[PDB]
Steps between C-alpha positions, in 0.01 A plus 500: 500500500484619883573194701698707781181705559268209556768366725502786694122494527529150627791602730287791612207283549719277743601792705 
């Protein structure tokens, strides 16, 4: 899977 990518999208969203 790609959890990290989703997290980074989550992360990116926060920024």
